[PDB]
Amino acid sequence: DAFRLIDTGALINNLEPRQTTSNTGLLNKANIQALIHGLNRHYYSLNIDYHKTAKETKMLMNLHKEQWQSGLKMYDYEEKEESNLAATKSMVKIAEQYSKRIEEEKELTEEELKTRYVGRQDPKKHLSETADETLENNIVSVLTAGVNSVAIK
Amino acid sequence: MSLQHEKVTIAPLVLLSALDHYERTQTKENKRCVGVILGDANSSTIRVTNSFALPFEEDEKNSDVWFLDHNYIENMNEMCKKINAKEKLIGWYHSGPKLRASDLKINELFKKYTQNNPLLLIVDVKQQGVGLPTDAYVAIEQVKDDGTSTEKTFLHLPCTIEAEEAEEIGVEHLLRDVRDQAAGGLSIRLTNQLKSLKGLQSKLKDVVEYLDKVINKELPINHTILGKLQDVFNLLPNLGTPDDDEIDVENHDRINISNNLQKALTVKTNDELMVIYISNLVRSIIAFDD
Amino acid sequence: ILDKIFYGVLDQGNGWLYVYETPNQDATYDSALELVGQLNKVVDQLFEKASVLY
Amino acid sequence: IHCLAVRNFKEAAKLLVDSLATFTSIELTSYESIATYASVTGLFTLERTDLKSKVIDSPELLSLISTTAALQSISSLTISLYASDYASYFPYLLETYANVLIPCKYLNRHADFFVREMRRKVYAQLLESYKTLSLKSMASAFGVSVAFLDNDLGKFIPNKQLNCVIDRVNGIVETNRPDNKNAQYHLLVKQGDGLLTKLQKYGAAVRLT
Amino acid sequence: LIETVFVKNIRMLSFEDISKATHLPKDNVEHLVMRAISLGLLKGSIDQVNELVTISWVQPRIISGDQITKMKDRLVEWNDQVEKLGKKMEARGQSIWV
Amino acid sequence: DVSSSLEARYFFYLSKINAIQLDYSTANEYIIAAIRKAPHNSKSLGFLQQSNKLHCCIQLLMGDIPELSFFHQSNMQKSLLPYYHLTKAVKLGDLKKFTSTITKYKQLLLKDDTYQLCVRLRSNVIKTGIRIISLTYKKISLRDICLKLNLDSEQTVEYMVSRAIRDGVIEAKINHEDGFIETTELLNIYDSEDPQQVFDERIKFANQLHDEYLVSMRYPEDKKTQQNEK
Amino acid sequence: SLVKLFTTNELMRWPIVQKTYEPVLNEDDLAFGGEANKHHWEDLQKRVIEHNLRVISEYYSRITLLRLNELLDLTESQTETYISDLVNQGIIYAKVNRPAKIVNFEKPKNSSQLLNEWSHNVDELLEHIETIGHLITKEEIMH
């Protein structure tokens, strides 16, 4: 954060409103109580924006070379088998938590059902989550594979 | 002077620092800005933290004549320690667009400073490339097996990044793009695949015209490239092997898990079909009553 | 061999003994068997909820 | 005894082994009858490994030793299966029908079912451990003749519930039972065909109303 | 022996092909392969029962105008395999490149 | 916008015409569609009997052979009594059993105008009989078939198989200088590329049910939210 | 030259070795000469015959049992007994077939092993071409 002291005579005269001319409203503090004691009685803070070029955006972004080596490299399948193995065991447990909830689910107010017949931590949604996150992992494995078969062959 | 060299990791700060330095000296329009380059060296990966400008004049009719202020550098290094006392001299950046044959003479002068063989880090100021828009070279002196005398010649080192916690988050802090050149969602990685396939296509094509140019543009027989070219052929795939059959049997396996994972989703979406219908069933009564 | 304590098959079409140490089964593929079973479980109770609609 | 009266012998087997550990002689048939039923069901459901460990982890069954005609026949039959010598099996298969299934109230309904199922089971175990058999060595094994055997086999193989083929030219029995990943696939697809089907109908039905 | 494997797309030779080319009996054709691998000129595995030598490594050796062209051709052919596929994939899933 | 009675009827009609054209694979798919739309009620009883009559008939035309359970779980046994005697007949391979069934119940079959479809089943006993014999013995003499199914010369039996494997019913081939019939099945198709093809199809089948879920779920929702009931 | 035979994998047979070190080392003591130390000359031939098998395991994945008899200079009965002892020690694994069409020296690979190798091979091609591509530019400038 950047700050700038306001002159001795002015604070007494209450020229705090003077300091809010030439903006349209972007104020938001990141601290109070140490920040807010100095701010009223000494200084007025300034906002910080950050400036970049479009060349910098690429440099910042690339922390990899795996953007033209990501269709010719990937992980070894032993780890993929660890992840897929873990995923299926989990979905069976979550399906039991989800069946238990839908013993009812016709009694008004969703929230009460989730406490009583455990639906807490939303197993319905939870099972869906594990399906999405493993479903994307496999599409990558394929896209690297098929690029190798057809490019090389 | 150490020969300890394998790789070059580059702070994002360097690339950017050198981009502005070029335009603020105002040695541009086919005139080079050459500065010192600062960082750690005497380790396999050469770690480049920072760069400064040096006063430099480039005769553009003769790139083999230049101005370098030798005194200044000694002055500058004292200031580099204030910043960080692991910064020491490790080379000098060039502003691209690529390696030149006037660079060896400039490299000479930079041997009175560095405890490591002077680095030449080409910071491209136009941002060309299919990885990081940097090449790295280092000057190494080696005998040639063809029958000619000892030359000093620039061997490439790969370009890479690594970064400090402060720098890396700052990068994201500045930036706001969600980036199709790194991973993410499914669509984002679909962009990376197509590019990688085309990246092999672009680079393999380059080797075809390089073999032809040695015997039809009279480039010299460079043994160092072609030995690596031969090891590509030894490690190259084959067909009709039980190795290549095992691949097919693994295709079966993983797709089946995906098949079942897809079917698992469908169960869940059919329950939400049914819940909304319970929501529909209630709304019937309310409609009748009003 | 019924014990499955080394592996192998007893051949009386020629009178030899094949001994194996070969990989047999697949764990990842095994667990798929339960996952179809679990999805078949959930839909029985789904369909009790859906007979409140018809 | 109710699982015994119906065709659920997986459930009956668990109950009737427990009846050895605690029996109750109030309103309930004899300890020798309860022992006989345990043996019958044990053979039905369990093959060698499982069956041997059941009657070796059953000391109570043993103290009762065979003290009636029904009990002999089933108890002797048990020994011959899990010992991997079915020489005596085929004559004893008759005796057990005669002295257990026909007299009992709860197995006469299954008298014919039992012998059909067991004829598969005993052959399967020999075919499992043998990649090849000769019809003659296999005929000697049970204590049967060559031609008689083919008939029994000719019933089991089309339902494809026994997985074997018989070269009648060479005389050998080949076993096409998959003992690899192909077996696991054969399980999976029929469940997943049904999964598909179950969702197609339940989903389509709620949209319409 | 090293020459033949290198210039062919395949990395396996029949022993009958070795027999002709080095003009040796079938006993010494097998010994020639053993000796070569011991030397570390070729690497792989030997089938005497499919009568193949299946190579995984060639020791780097001389370049010559002749050899320069032989490797060039193989890259054009493999360039074609890459190029036409990427077009199959571009035509496919057109709606999704975001 | 069609009612689900109309949809039940539509699919049932196709199954009739298709069966007549000697399509038994498309007919099978559509007759199962028609039944799942229809209720369980005695309201719908007569629609179901005609449907089940056709459903048994299609399976014997394929070589698929209906379940015995299917008659027993329904209380439709007496209506379906003539198809139950055909089911046992084709399975066993006994032409003699078959010929009895079609003479015993001729009148009933001819009422539903499904008798035409039923005479084509005299062929499927013979073809199903050869598939059972090729399962049971890998290699089998020609003469042994003639005894079992009560057929003529071995030359005749040769012709039955040559035709029968053009559809692929038997999945064997005849050696006429070695004098046996050798079947081609020895499974382990999981070492072939076949399951790849299969999993693809199930995945697309799932995708199609997802789509139908999307359009239908929101259309009645949309009517209620627009409609005033506040 | 005596130790060189055994610190490399080379083609050797026992009567090339026998001929060279008999007139030399029967005139030296310890492991030669005598009537009790020629049962140690006996033991050496076993080790040479064993060493041939170690070489053949590494290079040949499959060789014919019949050919192999020629190399060791032994009959088919004797050739087998030595394969057993080497598997017993746990240096290699092998499987012999008694009716003589193959002896295979290897322990057959797990499915996962096979697949690991084929992935590695592809990765290494990508690395080379990547570096080569940056080096073509340099060669236009240096020419």
mmCIF file of N, CA and C in Angstrom, chain C:
data_model
loop_
_atom_site.group_PDB
_atom_site.id
_atom_site.type_symbol
_atom_site.label_atom_id
_atom_site.label_comp_id
_atom_site.label_asym_id
_atom_site.label_seq_id
_atom_site.Cartn_x
_atom_site.Cartn_y
_atom_site.Cartn_z
ATOM 1 N N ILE C 1 -3.120 -77.289 -7.773
ATOM 2 C CA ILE C 1 -3.607 -76.308 -8.732
ATOM 3 C C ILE C 1 -4.990 -75.827 -8.327
ATOM 4 N N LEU C 2 -5.809 -76.714 -7.754
ATOM 5 C CA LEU C 2 -7.078 -76.246 -7.212
ATOM 6 C C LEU C 2 -6.847 -75.312 -6.042
ATOM 7 N N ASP C 3 -5.733 -75.502 -5.340
ATOM 8 C CA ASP C 3 -5.361 -74.606 -4.259
ATOM 9 C C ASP C 3 -4.903 -73.271 -4.807
ATOM 10 N N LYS C 4 -4.404 -73.272 -6.040
ATOM 11 C CA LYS C 4 -3.856 -72.078 -6.663
ATOM 12 C C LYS C 4 -2.710 -71.540 -5.807
ATOM 13 N N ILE C 5 -1.735 -72.413 -5.569
ATOM 14 C CA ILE C 5 -0.645 -72.132 -4.651
ATOM 15 C C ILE C 5 0.697 -72.137 -5.352
ATOM 16 N N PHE C 6 0.728 -72.438 -6.645
ATOM 17 C CA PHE C 6 1.835 -71.943 -7.436
ATOM 18 C C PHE C 6 1.437 -71.385 -8.794
ATOM 19 N N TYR C 7 0.623 -72.110 -9.538
ATOM 20 C CA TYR C 7 -0.188 -71.629 -10.651
ATOM 21 C C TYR C 7 -0.073 -72.888 -11.485
ATOM 22 N N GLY C 8 -0.366 -72.826 -12.762
ATOM 23 C CA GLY C 8 0.033 -73.914 -13.624
ATOM 24 C C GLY C 8 -1.161 -74.754 -14.019
ATOM 25 N N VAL C 9 -0.986 -75.532 -15.079
ATOM 26 C CA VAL C 9 -2.062 -76.378 -15.575
ATOM 27 C C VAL C 9 -1.487 -77.747 -15.884
ATOM 28 N N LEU C 10 -2.281 -78.780 -15.630
ATOM 29 C CA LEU C 10 -1.856 -80.159 -15.823
ATOM 30 C C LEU C 10 -2.424 -80.648 -17.149
ATOM 31 N N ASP C 11 -1.534 -81.071 -18.037
ATOM 32 C CA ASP C 11 -1.841 -81.334 -19.435
ATOM 33 C C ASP C 11 -1.760 -82.836 -19.667
ATOM 34 N N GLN C 12 -2.895 -83.445 -20.006
ATOM 35 C CA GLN C 12 -2.961 -84.876 -20.267
ATOM 36 C C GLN C 12 -3.298 -85.157 -21.723
ATOM 37 N N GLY C 13 -3.297 -84.125 -22.567
ATOM 38 C CA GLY C 13 -3.389 -84.332 -23.997
ATOM 39 C C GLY C 13 -2.066 -84.706 -24.611
ATOM 40 N N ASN C 14 -0.988 -84.368 -23.921
ATOM 41 C CA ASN C 14 0.367 -84.699 -24.305
ATOM 42 C C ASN C 14 1.158 -85.266 -23.152
ATOM 43 N N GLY C 15 0.727 -85.034 -21.920
ATOM 44 C CA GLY C 15 1.478 -85.434 -20.757
ATOM 45 C C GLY C 15 2.665 -84.531 -20.525
ATOM 46 N N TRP C 16 2.387 -83.244 -20.390
ATOM 47 C CA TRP C 16 3.351 -82.297 -19.872
ATOM 48 C C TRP C 16 2.730 -81.549 -18.710
ATOM 49 N N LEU C 17 3.563 -80.741 -18.073
ATOM 50 C CA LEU C 17 3.150 -79.874 -16.983
ATOM 51 C C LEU C 17 3.612 -78.467 -17.317
ATOM 52 N N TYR C 18 2.656 -77.563 -17.502
ATOM 53 C CA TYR C 18 2.948 -76.149 -17.660
ATOM 54 C C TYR C 18 2.955 -75.508 -16.288
ATOM 55 N N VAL C 19 3.995 -74.739 -16.016
ATOM 56 C CA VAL C 19 4.115 -73.972 -14.789
ATOM 57 C C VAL C 19 4.104 -72.521 -15.209
ATOM 58 N N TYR C 20 3.333 -71.696 -14.514
ATOM 59 C CA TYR C 20 3.357 -70.277 -14.842
ATOM 60 C C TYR C 20 3.681 -69.427 -13.637
ATOM 61 N N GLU C 21 4.193 -68.221 -13.935
ATOM 62 C CA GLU C 21 4.202 -67.143 -12.964
ATOM 63 C C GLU C 21 3.573 -65.899 -13.594
ATOM 64 N N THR C 22 2.593 -66.079 -14.415
ATOM 65 C CA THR C 22 2.174 -64.954 -15.235
ATOM 66 C C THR C 22 1.179 -64.054 -14.505
ATOM 67 N N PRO C 23 1.169 -62.767 -14.850
ATOM 68 C CA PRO C 23 0.102 -61.872 -14.371
ATOM 69 C C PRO C 23 -1.280 -62.388 -14.746
ATOM 70 N N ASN C 24 -2.184 -62.413 -13.764
ATOM 71 C CA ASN C 24 -3.583 -62.770 -14.005
ATOM 72 C C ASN C 24 -4.480 -61.910 -13.134
ATOM 73 N N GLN C 25 -5.188 -60.978 -13.738
ATOM 74 C CA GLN C 25 -6.543 -60.555 -13.395
ATOM 75 C C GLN C 25 -6.268 -59.106 -13.743
ATOM 76 N N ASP C 26 -7.114 -58.174 -13.363
ATOM 77 C CA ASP C 26 -6.638 -56.800 -13.343
ATOM 78 C C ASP C 26 -7.391 -56.069 -12.236
ATOM 79 N N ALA C 27 -6.645 -55.414 -11.335
ATOM 80 C CA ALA C 27 -7.244 -54.791 -10.150
ATOM 81 C C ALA C 27 -8.180 -53.651 -10.519
ATOM 82 N N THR C 28 -7.722 -52.774 -11.407
ATOM 83 C CA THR C 28 -8.517 -51.627 -11.822
ATOM 84 C C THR C 28 -9.815 -52.088 -12.441
ATOM 85 N N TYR C 29 -9.720 -53.139 -13.234
ATOM 86 C CA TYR C 29 -10.852 -53.695 -13.940
ATOM 87 C C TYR C 29 -11.782 -54.431 -12.982
ATOM 88 N N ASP C 30 -11.202 -55.093 -11.979
ATOM 89 C CA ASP C 30 -11.973 -55.713 -10.902
ATOM 90 C C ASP C 30 -12.884 -54.736 -10.178
ATOM 91 N N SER C 31 -12.380 -53.546 -9.871
ATOM 92 C CA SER C 31 -13.156 -52.621 -9.061
ATOM 93 C C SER C 31 -14.318 -52.034 -9.845
ATOM 94 N N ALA C 32 -14.244 -52.094 -11.175
ATOM 95 C CA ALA C 32 -15.341 -51.657 -12.027
ATOM 96 C C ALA C 32 -16.588 -52.469 -11.757
ATOM 97 N N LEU C 33 -16.383 -53.703 -11.331
ATOM 98 C CA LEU C 33 -17.457 -54.657 -11.176
ATOM 99 C C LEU C 33 -18.360 -54.193 -10.041
ATOM 100 N N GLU C 34 -17.740 -53.653 -8.983
ATOM 101 C CA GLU C 34 -18.481 -53.131 -7.842
ATOM 102 C C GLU C 34 -19.166 -51.820 -8.171
ATOM 103 N N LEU C 35 -18.565 -51.034 -9.063
ATOM 104 C CA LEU C 35 -19.088 -49.708 -9.356
ATOM 105 C C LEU C 35 -20.368 -49.802 -10.169
ATOM 106 N N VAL C 36 -20.432 -50.738 -11.118
ATOM 107 C CA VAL C 36 -21.715 -50.997 -11.759
ATOM 108 C C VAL C 36 -22.717 -51.452 -10.709
ATOM 109 N N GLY C 37 -22.274 -52.306 -9.786
ATOM 110 C CA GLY C 37 -23.167 -52.777 -8.742
ATOM 111 C C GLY C 37 -23.720 -51.645 -7.897
ATOM 112 N N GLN C 38 -22.886 -50.643 -7.614
ATOM 113 C CA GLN C 38 -23.310 -49.536 -6.766
ATOM 114 C C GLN C 38 -24.303 -48.638 -7.483
ATOM 115 N N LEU C 39 -24.088 -48.422 -8.779
ATOM 116 C CA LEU C 39 -25.007 -47.621 -9.573
ATOM 117 C C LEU C 39 -26.340 -48.320 -9.725
ATOM 118 N N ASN C 40 -26.326 -49.644 -9.702
ATOM 119 C CA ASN C 40 -27.564 -50.393 -9.800
ATOM 120 C C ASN C 40 -28.313 -50.349 -8.481
ATOM 121 N N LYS C 41 -27.575 -50.211 -7.380
ATOM 122 C CA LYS C 41 -28.188 -50.023 -6.071
ATOM 123 C C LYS C 41 -28.962 -48.715 -5.993
ATOM 124 N N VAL C 42 -28.330 -47.622 -6.414
ATOM 125 C CA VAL C 42 -28.884 -46.285 -6.224
ATOM 126 C C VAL C 42 -30.192 -46.110 -6.979
ATOM 127 N N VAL C 43 -30.353 -46.800 -8.106
ATOM 128 C CA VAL C 43 -31.513 -46.544 -8.953
ATOM 129 C C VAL C 43 -32.769 -47.242 -8.475
ATOM 130 N N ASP C 44 -32.626 -48.305 -7.699
ATOM 131 C CA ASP C 44 -33.773 -48.934 -7.069
ATOM 132 C C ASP C 44 -34.486 -47.950 -6.164
ATOM 133 N N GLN C 45 -33.709 -47.190 -5.395
ATOM 134 C CA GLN C 45 -34.283 -46.235 -4.461
ATOM 135 C C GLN C 45 -34.684 -44.951 -5.167
ATOM 136 N N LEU C 46 -33.988 -44.607 -6.247
ATOM 137 C CA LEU C 46 -34.431 -43.502 -7.082
ATOM 138 C C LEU C 46 -35.841 -43.736 -7.587
ATOM 139 N N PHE C 47 -36.121 -44.966 -7.988
ATOM 140 C CA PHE C 47 -37.372 -45.311 -8.636
ATOM 141 C C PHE C 47 -38.504 -45.478 -7.635
ATOM 142 N N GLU C 48 -38.186 -45.686 -6.354
ATOM 143 C CA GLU C 48 -39.203 -45.540 -5.318
ATOM 144 C C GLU C 48 -39.609 -44.080 -5.151
ATOM 145 N N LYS C 49 -38.665 -43.156 -5.329
ATOM 146 C CA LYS C 49 -39.004 -41.738 -5.302
ATOM 147 C C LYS C 49 -39.813 -41.317 -6.528
ATOM 148 N N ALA C 50 -39.657 -42.016 -7.650
ATOM 149 C CA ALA C 50 -40.273 -41.634 -8.916
ATOM 150 C C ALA C 50 -41.655 -42.227 -9.129
ATOM 151 N N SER C 51 -42.103 -43.080 -8.217
ATOM 152 C CA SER C 51 -43.440 -43.647 -8.221
ATOM 153 C C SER C 51 -44.362 -42.837 -7.340
ATOM 154 N N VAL C 52 -43.863 -41.696 -6.870
ATOM 155 C CA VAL C 52 -44.632 -40.683 -6.183
ATOM 156 C C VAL C 52 -45.046 -39.596 -7.142
ATOM 157 N N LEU C 53 -44.644 -39.735 -8.398
ATOM 158 C CA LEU C 53 -44.869 -38.781 -9.463
ATOM 159 C C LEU C 53 -45.815 -39.302 -10.521
ATOM 160 N N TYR C 54 -45.728 -40.588 -10.842
ATOM 161 C CA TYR C 54 -46.481 -41.120 -11.960
ATOM 162 C C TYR C 54 -47.938 -41.020 -11.715
#
